[PDB]
Structures are given as C-alpha cells and as structure tokens.
Symmetry: C3
Subunit: 394 residues, 3 copies
C-alpha cells in the first residue's frame, strides 16, 4: 500500500533525512494530505525511521489523525554521564537506534508540534496519533536542563483523543512531552531521562494513562505535571532522581504501584484543591545529594496535600537525609503535609526515616484521619480537628 | 522468508482486501496451510495490514497456531460523539490506522473466529496467536450497543494457550473480544470503547492477564466478564463509562492498581461463590447521567460480593449521584454489598460520598471483618456475625 | 537504509539461518561493525527474524549498543504438556513464531551473550539493546529444568544501561534471562515458562523494572533473583507454578500489584539484610502438588524476611496444602516468617488457610508491627519485642 513510508527510501524528499529529518517528515505529511483528501478517506499512514543518526533542523507539524511514527527502539545513552567522563575510548558517545538529534534552526523550540487549527467541534480533534520506539535527543544540555537548552520533544497543542506515546526514548530536552487538552492519552513503556520535565498534561485532561515508564527528569521541573486533570491513572512507573508528580486542580486520580524516588521534596503534590485522589501501594524514597536545590524546603512534604478527601494507603515512606542538610535548619522534615482541606485519609503507611520526621496537619485542615500511618511521635497536628489511631509505639 | 504477508501486496489474493479483507486473510491462511503441512513444520506466519479502510464481508477462521495479524495502530475515533454531532467540517469521520470495517454478509456475526475442531487432547490447542495494533469497527451502532448490531470483533471458541491481544482498537461492536477456554491469555495495552462488552472470558479460564487497557464499554454488558476464572490478574487498567468487572465463580483473582469509573452500580461483582479474590489499591468513582439504566439499583453496590474470603484493601470509593437520581428513592446507596459468604475482609478503604452511603452486610454473611473501612454511620450490618473496627468519626 | 537486516534475506550470510541462526547473526554483527566504525557513527541496527524454525548452533555475542533483534511473537507452546501427552494427531508439536531452537554445539550454555570487554568507564557500557517478540526454546528438558539442559536464553555479562526485553517467549531453558550489572533494565510483557529460572539480576543492579510478565519457572530456581539490587520495581506480573522472588541484599524494592502463585514455600524471600522493601497489593496463593520438593519446608514462609524496615500491606495470603503434605509433620505452616531484623511492618493483610497457619516472629527480631494482619491465633511471636493490633476474632 502507499500508506507506508521509510524516511530513508522515500524518493519524494528534497533533502536528506540525515541532514534534516523534520523537512523530510513534513514533506511526507504533505504527500499524505495530497492523497487522503476527504472525511472518509483519511485512514493515516506509517512513517518508519530505521536506525541512524538524523538531524532535525525544521519543526514537524502534524495535523493528521492516525499517523504512526515508529523506529527501532528508545536508543538511550546517558549524555549526563558522558559529559562528566573521559570518553576518548568509549565505543559510542551518542544515543542511537532511530535517533533524532533535535537541532532546530527554524526559530522554533519543538521537534514535533501536533496541532490542528480551528475549533475541535467544527474541524474535529486529532485522534490516535502514535509515536513509538524512537529517540528524541537535545544533543547538549546542562543540569537541571530547565531552562536548559529550551528544547521540546513532542508538543500537542490542540485537543486530542486516544493519542499514544510508547517505547520511546527522550534525553537532554527541557520538556520531553507536553500534551495540551488530552482525552484518554496513553503514555506507556517510555524511557525519559536527563530532561528538565518528563510529562506535562497542560490546559486540561481526561483519563490520561501513564504506565510502565522510566521517568528521570531533574529538580527544576516535573516528572508528571497535570492541571485541570480528571481521572489520571499513574501506575507501574519507576520515577527517579527528582520524582515530582504535581496535580493542579486534579481530581479522582489513581496513583498506585509506582517506585518513586527523589533527592528533593514534593514527590507528589496535590495542589489548588486537588481532591479524591488515591495514592496507594507506592514505594517512596527521599535521599539527598544527586544535585541540590532550594526550590522546596523539607517542610513541604514528600507528599503535599491541598485539597479534600484524598486517600493515602499502603505506602512506604523511606527518608534518608543527613540532619545537617535538612531545611529549615533544626526543623524536623515532613513526610506528609496536609496543607489544607477536609476529610483527607491516611491509613496503613510505614514511615522509616533516619531522623525524626512528621506527618503535619495544618491548622486549617478538618477531619483528617491518620490510621496506622504515624506513631504519636510522627504526628504534628496543628488542629484538634483530626482523628488519630496511632501506629503503636513506645 | 515466505512467512510474511501484506494483505495489499500479496499476489495470491483473488479479491481486493479493501473490498473484503476477510476473504484475503482466509486465502492467506489457506496458502500457509498448503506450505506448512506437518506438526514440526508449522511455525506460523505474519499478516501485516497497512493503514487503510478495509471492509470485511467474510468471517475469518483461524485454526493455525502462532499467527500474527498486525497493523499500524489502534485507530480509535469516537463514533458515539460523531453520531451526536454536526460533522460536516470534521477532517475525519471514521476510525483509522489499519481499519477493518466489520460488515459481514455471510450470515456470521464475528470478524475473526479463532477455532479448531476436535478434542484438544487429540488435535492440540491453538497456541500464541497474536493480534496487534489494528482497529476493528462495527461501523454503525446505537447505545448501549447490546444487543446493538450483534457484531463481534474477535472470538476464540476452542481451547487456547498464551494468546495475545495487544495495542488494538475496538469500537462500535456488540462484543469486542470473546475468549472461551483460555489459558494464560494476555490482553494488554488495548483501546476498547463504545462497545456493548469489552472482554468476555467464557466457559472457563486460567491465569488471564488483563493489563494497561482502556475499557470503555456501556451499561448493558461487561467491561470484563469472566466465569469459572482461576487466577485472573486485572491491573493498570482505566475502565470507564460503565465499568463492570463481573466474576462468576471466579477465584484467586488479583484486581489491583486500576482506575475504575461507572455511571451505574456493579463496578465489581463477585458472583456465584467467587472466593479469595483481592481488590486492592483501586480508585472507584460512581457518578450519574452518562446514560441511564435500571439494570441495577443503587443498593446493588459499587462492589458486590457473593463468595468467601475476599479481600478489599487500600481503595478509594468516591460516590457522587444527585439524591433525586438515587434508586430506591430515599434509601442510602450501598458502597460495598457483602451479599453472602464467609470471612470476607475489608480494611483501610476510604469512602467519600455526596449523601450518606453504606457498607451493607447481608444477614447470611458470617465472620466479615470491616477494619478502618467504614465509620459507624457507614456500616449497615444485618447480622451480629461480623467484626467492626470503625473508622473514627467522633472526637 | 542499510541498518535493517532480515536473517533470511541478507545476502552476506555464508550459512543458512535455519541451520545456524547464531552464525548468521554473528555475521550480521560483523557487518555492522565494518560499517559503523567511530564513536559518533554507531547508531546500531535492526535484525528481523521472520516466522520460522531456526536452529542455533553457535553462541551469539553482542557488543553493539542499540541493536534490536525482533521477531513476530512469543511463539509459546507447552513442551511440558507435549512431553506427557500422546501427540500423534496434534496439529503442532513445536513452539513457533520466530522460533530459535537453542542447540549449541560450541560447549557454551548461552544462546545469546551480551558482553563488551574492558572497563565500562574506559570503553562504555552496552546501552539500550532491545530483544522483542521472538521465541528462545531449549528443545528438550525435564522438570524442574535445573540442572536440566544447562541452556541459557539471553545472558548480559558486562555492565549495561537501559536494556529492554519485551514480548518474548522463553521455554525449556535452564535460565531464561540473566542480566549482570544492570542499570535501569526493562523486562516487560514477556512469556517465560517451563524454565529452571526466569529472571536473574546478578552481580548488582539499579532500578530494574519487571512488569506485566508471565513468569512460570519451576521449583529448583527463581522467578526473579536479584542480588545487591537497589530500587527494583516488580509489578503487574503473573508469577506461577513455583513463584520465588528472592532478594539478596536488595533494598528499596517496590513489589506491588502482582498475582503470585507457588506449589512451594518462599514466594518472596528478603535475604541477607534486605531492607525497606514494599510488598503491597499482591495476591499470594500457596498450593501443593504441581511437582514436589523439599528445598524448603513449610516453616520457611510464603514470605520470608531477613532485614529491616520492610513493609507488607494490603495483600491476601491464601494457603491450601493438605495437612498430610505439610512439613515438618505436625507443625503449623508459616505465612510470613520474620526471621531477623528490626521495625518490619505488616498491616491490613488477609490470611486465609485450610489449616492453622501463622505469622512467626523469630526470637531475634525487634519492633515488628503486626496490625490487622493476623488474628491472635495467626500470630506465633517468639519474642515479646513486637506490637500486635490483632485482626478481631472474638465477640
């Protein structure tokens, strides 16, 4: 069929894909649109990227539904370690597989912009676009990569449904993946590392599914940021270095069965009246020194709750920070800060810390339940309006 | 090798795959069988479906193990929203990617029937058939799609081992996926929506794995139905609209780490003595109005338990139904109904509801434990044969 | 591009891949190295294996980063059932899809060895090698497959980063997958069955992700073995037959949302001071008779803890072993043995057993918390240094 392209064999390109794969992909998209021209004759296409090193100089703009862009793997190599190492004898010094080097010279910061102009009720949303098994690489960057090199890997900026980002590698980008106005996106089995932020669901979203990823962005941004987000599912992920899952007016999320590690506070922040979110069966680890920051002090919380009726159950909170590094100086660090809200619920969580640490209930909070989720020594209730069933202690 | 086919380039086809891809795939299967003729020379084959709109007029019958049918993606587009919208200016009005329009004219309701005749012990089971990354579409349908258009996407009707359905899209079918007699099936990373039922594991099954799917079937059928199911694993799924996981004599299931939402009761029903099942670390949301039904009333439960020794831990139960829409009118809706059985266990669950709501223990139940899983006001125990450690509510 | 190979069409092969696919893959690797000759011109390559039966006689050695070896599916067929059945009329008697029959004639046990010589700081690690969707088959083996046929599927034996093993089938191997010195490996959506051990993370590892697999290895080995392992994440798996997850000096693991079943003790063993590991929202099932062994007695525990500050929450422990088969004879079997360590935490777990069974706290342990995770009759505390909040049992 004529719906399958390989960027290196397609004879219609005016430029080499190794020199500018963005131009080649834009030219393929123009070809698709010249062939798929009515409401009922737009099934989409496959663009395959074989293993190779490809510069992108021109931003790709996608407004075609059901486009699959697929390569041979995530291609990750730690450019952070490379850039602190003597690499003269390294067999390879670049990320690989189907490797796009994001090197825009066109005035834009995105490698891929997924955007349709026009009101979605009138022209339709962008549907079931698939990015699979290739590598997006910002080439050069310094920690913590935000503002960094200012490069974005994939940015969806118009309303979309059932999009899919799977098996990809993202490295040395200020923003790996940004999806605005996402409905049922699937972000699964990716390897995102040494990036300023990993996943940002902006504007609003419904029922995003974020599963089975490595997310290893640094301390100036977010591993997962989601605003006006209903029904987020975050599970099966390994989120490292500076794990920061922030919901801003996010509700009815299910954040379960993840391995969560940060060298900084705010592993999960439920902000701006984020309510009825479940945090269950996660391992939380707070350590210190892989980078340092004063973005947060250690009273912010490993988990920070500003909202109602959230549920925190069955987790481990493991905290190991030398006392001399804890801020504000002389203060006990906070495991969970219930900053504001009503009827939040903490049950059956195990707190293991190298120094005395606390679940803090702000004086404004009401009806918080803390049930086998803190010994008496681990609870700092600044209001009598709470219910405590202590974890047994001496 | 000669084991790789593309439905649009294979020269042996006597009909266009755009006109009847079912006939073309059947012709490919006959070709495979003519070349793979002994029990040690049947490694199977791959059938690739490039992006395109393909009508299926003839049911495909698969009785070859290790067949892979693969496309370019799940191709979902909401035909339900289309059919309630003014679409004259929409860029697309059809689902896409590798898109099969299920339009049987052969008197059969399935697009794909996976079935071998004979006693499995004699002729062997069907093994490790792989459906990946294509779209099955019933073309036209009306809510709640059951009985609907009667169309079925994929139906396995003989005993099978290690089959795999991954990355697919299913839309506008009465039944997306039916697997009868499945051992260790893998149903993962699919997008099933606007179907009557999503996944039906019929007859019996052993250790089915249902992970990382979107399941968005409506209120007349099941998101997941499984009868005589041992050892189900259901995790990492987002199940929406009319979430209904029903086990019928299912035991030792692990139902964990799911996002579960319905506009109706019966998000999980453990029926017909379903025992020793774990329901842990799930978010349950009950809302109202995206469709309405009287299939269940609000006393049925968000979770309904008829069986022994089940375990319900670390969940959130969030309930928001306007009082005027609650039925029976005036009665408190039920969050968990323990309808029958012995030694069921609820612990460390949080119930948040817009009206007073209850965990109900039927009079027939024995030795139920309810431990930090209901305040006193949230428990309606109809037998003294229970143990309550209340979620605190009085200072 | 010239970076995509098909083992059956590449004209540079001097041996048929059906006779020795190992030689052909080695020849492809040599070709890649001849074309990719500097540290900025080594993006890697794809090697595609179409459906077919391929003998491997020569061990493959991979020292190229970003190599993808991919086939058409996991290809599983139960050779264990085959070898106890009358198969004369079976349609197929071999595993299939992209089927590598591991038949080394070179005195090595590995089908695939992934190894670079030289210090990783000097020559680099092996990065992001991808094995996807093919079948590695040891051809003939007897239970429990260790020592068995001594065959290993894939073995990484030099330090590696972000490797990926996905969608594979492994069958009838002594060791399916071994990874030494793994940093952020991804082992996902595989089908490993009728092998001695499934996954072994040797030497040391950091943040391995083991998700969404069927792991069905037998009772002489390990489903998941990990030594000096920091930050393992094990979730969404169905682990069967002889589930055994053993950590040796492993810490900060997250073992959640799994379906876990064994006919033997030691479903999870946290050994040699394994600390701050989470075991949450898993279904544990212990049964008897699908093979028998005395490797462990029933006092070892379904979960065995030798370490500090571990967390066991929201699980079900379901135990069904006939009393006449329990060892030592006349003794109550152990559900969780806290063998050594401080401040371990058990909360909100449901224990269901056919005979009296116990959480046992060794006399050496300190500050164990058992909170709604055992009735009085289910706790055998051999030290007074513990905290008990009993699961209620008396009215």
């Amino acid at each position: 069929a004529d719906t399958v392209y390989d960027v290196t064999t397609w004879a219609g390109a005016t430029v080499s894909p190794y020199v500018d794969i963005g131009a080649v992909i834009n030219q393929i998209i123009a070809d698709i649109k010249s062939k798929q021209t009515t409401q009922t004759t737009r099934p989409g296409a496959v663009i395959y990227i074989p293993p190779g090193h490809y510069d992108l100089l021109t931003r790709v703009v996608i407004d075609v539904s059901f486009l699959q862009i697929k390569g041979a793997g995530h291609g990750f190599l730690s450019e952070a370690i490379r850039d602190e190492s003597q690499t003269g004898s390294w067999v390879e010094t670049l990320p690989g597989a189907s490797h796009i080097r994001v090197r825009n010279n066109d005035g834009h910061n995105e490698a891929f912009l997924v955007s349709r102009t026009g009101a979605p009720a009138t022209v339709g949303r962008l549907n079931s676009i698939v990015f699979q098994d290739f590598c997006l690489d910002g080439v050069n960057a310094s920690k913590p990569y935000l503002p960094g090199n200012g490069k974005t890997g994939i940015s969806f900026q118009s309303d979309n449904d059932a999009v899919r980002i799977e098996g990809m590698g993202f490295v040395y980008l200020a923003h790996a993946l940004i999806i605005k106005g996402a409905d049922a996106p699937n972000i699964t089995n990716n390897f995102i590392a040494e990036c300023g932020s990993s996943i940002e669901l902006t504007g609003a979203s419904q029922v995003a599914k974020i599963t089975n990823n490595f997310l290893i962005s640094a301390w100036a941004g977010y591993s997962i940021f989601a605003e006006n987000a209903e029904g987020l599912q975050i599970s099966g992920n390994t989120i490292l270095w500076a794990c920061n899952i922030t919901l801003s007016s996010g509700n009815r999320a299910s954040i379960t069965s993840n391995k969560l590690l940060s060298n900084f506070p705010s592993q999960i922040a439920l902000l701006n009246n984020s309510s009825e979110n479940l945090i269950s069966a996660n391992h939380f680890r707070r350590v210190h020194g892989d980078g340092t920051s004063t973005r947060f002090d250690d009273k912010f919380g490993m988990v920070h709750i500003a909202g109602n009726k959230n549920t925190v159950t069955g987790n481990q909170f493991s905290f190991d920070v030398p006392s001399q590094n804890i801020t504000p100086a002389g203060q006990d660090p906070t495991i969970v800060l219930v900053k504001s809200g009503d009827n939040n619920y903490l049950a059956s969580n195990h707190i293991t810390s190298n120094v005395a640490a606390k679940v803090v209930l702000d004086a404004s909070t009401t009806a918080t339940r803390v049930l086998h989720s803190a010994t008496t020594a681990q609870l700092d209730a600044l209001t009598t309006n709470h219910f405590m069933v202590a974890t047994p202690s001496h």
